[PDB]
């Protein structure tokens, strides 16, 4: 299954994941494709922040879904 | 330069004379980032002028950021960019080299536009009252209206350079040589077929000739620049003057008023470098040498994103980087070494103008990590 992670500038990152994958797993697959440590990543879907313990199916993230990546860098 | 400082010294002093006897309080502004203009309008457009002079602090919904100054600077920046979003039909872009904005004559598209124009004028005046900076750029016509100066037809060169240079040709040449016709009316592009507004009593039935072309040039510019937006200007200036009195703001020139609202027109890395502080690193540490090399390798658009990253706004204060403001007083740009890990992206605390920079192992990695952070996190507060 392919999902899309959209960055602030609009760049798209295509991932190969399964509905049983955890949000922590998806953040790790982004680290290998963009070099960003997971503890600096925050994923948004349908206006809700995704907790690391939940799976994709727990958020009803089906095929070709688009997630939003925001970075936790500024205070 | 120095003459500008003399005006601002008098300007700020008289502003502080007028709020003697005001028990100022901290006033919260709860907004969503994707609705920052609508939310701030709901939260502030019914505040009294005395209430508007309170110290605002911003709470972005769903964001860990705590406003000690850095969130307010970003709020001013992103709200000033959303006021000119054409989706609100409040403003339009003036055609030219540098992009400036004009009041949209079709603003009754939005039924409550006069309410929003007064709010936009309030925000601009509030930004000047707070000594904060906006990403606003107006035409010479608009600045003259704020300064109470009379608008001349020569000011059309800044509003519309090519339309103005069509008027010089009409004045310079004969109407028999144009190849088209002109009447004493101007077009109403409100999605109607040949709906026009008269520049004169029964002006649509009067042809422009050599006997009256000078009167036409004068009448069309007063319309394009004040008549067509008369009600929207009055609403804007009403909200603006409620906070900054007209007698005080009018001491400035159009160029000075633009600098007062937008700050310095460029980002000088050399000026930033001579006003930088370091904690755990030294001015000659290798990552600091790589940092300045990377910052200098950025174009004007990317160094703006960097300024937003560490301070909250893309704008430079008028006194330069030696006057960068923090929480209590002046806090220069500072770089702290991040010892946690070298695989982390750089982080920033916009309230202290502080950049947490990991001890990267190569110039290529530092430049890549820095550009990724400032481009993919130019806005948004994920940390406290």
Numbering used by the authors:
A (entry chain C): 1 to 75
B (entry chain A): 3991 to 4374
Text taken from the publication that reported this structure:
We thus interrogated the reactivity of wild-type (WT) HUWE1HECT toward Ub-Prg, which carries an alkyne functionality at the C-terminus of Gly75 and was expected to preferentially react with the active site due to ubiquitin-mediated interactions. The resulting vinyl thioether linkage closely mimics the native thioester, except for one oxygen atom, and is resistant to hydrolysis. To illuminate how the HECT domain of HUWE1 interacts with the donor ubiquitin and understand the significance of the C-tail, we determined a crystal structure of the reconstituted ubiquitin-HUWE1HECT complex. Consistent with our mutational analyses, this structure shows the ubiquitin C-terminus linked to the catalytic cysteine of HUWE1 via a vinyl thioether (as well as Supplementary Figure 3a in the Supporting Information). The globular portion of ubiquitin contacts the C-lobe through a conserved, catalytically important interface. Besides this in-cis interaction, the crystal lattice does not contain any hydrophobic protein interfaces suspected to be functionally relevant; and, although Cys4184 mediates an intermolecular disulfide bond between adjacent HECT domains in the crystal, the ubiquitin-HUWE1HECT complex is monomeric in solution. In contrast, our structure of the donor ubiquitin-HUWE1HECT complex reveals an L-conformation, as seen in distinct crystal forms of several NEDD4-type E3s in apo, ubiquitin and substrate-bound forms,12,20−22 and structures of a truncated E6AP HECT domain. Interestingly, our crystal structure closely recapitulates the specific rotational state of the C-lobe within an L-conformation that is critical for ubiquitin transfer to a substrate. An exception is a structure of an autoinhibited C-terminal construct of HUWE1, in which the C-tail is locked in an inactive state.
